[PDB]
Amino acid sequence: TNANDLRNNEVFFISPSNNTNKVLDKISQSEVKLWNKLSGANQKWRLIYDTNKQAYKIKVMDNTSLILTWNAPLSSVSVKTDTNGDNQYWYLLQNYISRNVIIRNYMNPNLVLQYNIDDTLMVSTQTSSSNQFFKFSNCIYEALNNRNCKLQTQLNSDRFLSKNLNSQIIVLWQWIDSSRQKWIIEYNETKSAYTLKCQENNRYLTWIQNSNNYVETYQSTDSLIQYWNINYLDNDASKYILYNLQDTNRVLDVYNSQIANGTHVIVDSYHGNTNQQWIINLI
Structure with missing residues (x-):
């Protein structure tokens, strides 16, 4: 289906490539983690495309309006208030055949989002590991x-x-x-x-x-x-x-x-x- 394409203004579950039962989850007012899918609003993310930057904001849909943010210069990520920081935009580029998406930071595109074995997330330099590949489901x-x-x-x-x-x-x-x-x-x-x-x-x-x-x-x-x-x-x-x-x-x-x-x-x-x-x- 094309229903899961990375369209502006669509809302998604974002999952690690290695586990279709887990999703990106806003667990607190600052912390994100991978968690079992519950289909709660804190597991749903709206894409807001910025055409000038050719990059997206990723906004949680639990009513708090917080967006996925790289805590530069640290390796951590969070959800934070939108202040239009370069660290709050992400390239979403997709492999057409695998459907995997790399979530790459706009402020430093050497850094991509990574999920860890312990379900935490961070940014890191790129490897060939599926721990930097995500699936998006509308x-x-x-x-x-x-x-x-x-x-x-x-x-x-x-x-x-x-x-x-x-x-x-x-x-x-x-x-x-x-x-x-x-x-x-x-x-x-x-x-x-x-x-x-x-x-x-x-x-x-x-x-x-x-x-x-x-x-x-x-x-x-x-x-x-x-x-x-x-x-x-x-x-x-x-x-x-x-x-x-x-x-x-x-x-x-x-x-x-x-x-x-x-x-x-x-x-x-x-x-x-x-x-x-x-x-x-x-x-």
Whole structure:
């Protein structure tokens, strides 16, 4: 899959090449360590690419906003407040075939991140050892791909993304355990984004472009209107934003932030307020 590619603004588990059950873990307000995967937010890392430097910040997703930092001139690493230090940027270069990634410090690119036998991390000069090779796995793909899900608006604990009765229009509705409210989320390799298929009619969540900007169930199409970048909120891994590929500044949104049964779901310009935030759970 291309779902684990090192895209800007995606959130990852970062694992040692020699153990797919371990991940980079923020264990305290300063310390990182390899730990058994628990899929907690302190084990999830957002990539923020800096085009000028051709290097990335690596930000923990537990709400603290701290970033992976080389404690120059020492050999240690930590999570620290972002002060835009050169020591807080990292080249992420990948071997296309092995999929291994070398995490190389921007301030001193002679130094790469290394994991030790005792699960600690440090920077070191480069060898040929797999103790400097990491794998990156996209968290959302690991969790939701090919899964039957429900999508709750953050506006109300009992309002869900639902196909309306006898209509293609998608609206909010309280949970009634209907196939109209169950969505199979499937990653599409060609578009590098997701479709969401309504269980009741096997048709897909699609932006219908006109002045109303409603989402509807629609037949399969190659058009970008049917494809969605599903992401966590910028600094909250418990909630999701769904950006439409036809215009990625526009997102799945609840009309006028209303909560009544029947309220239109639409695609509108991003602001990040609660009417654009969704709670995705596995059925």
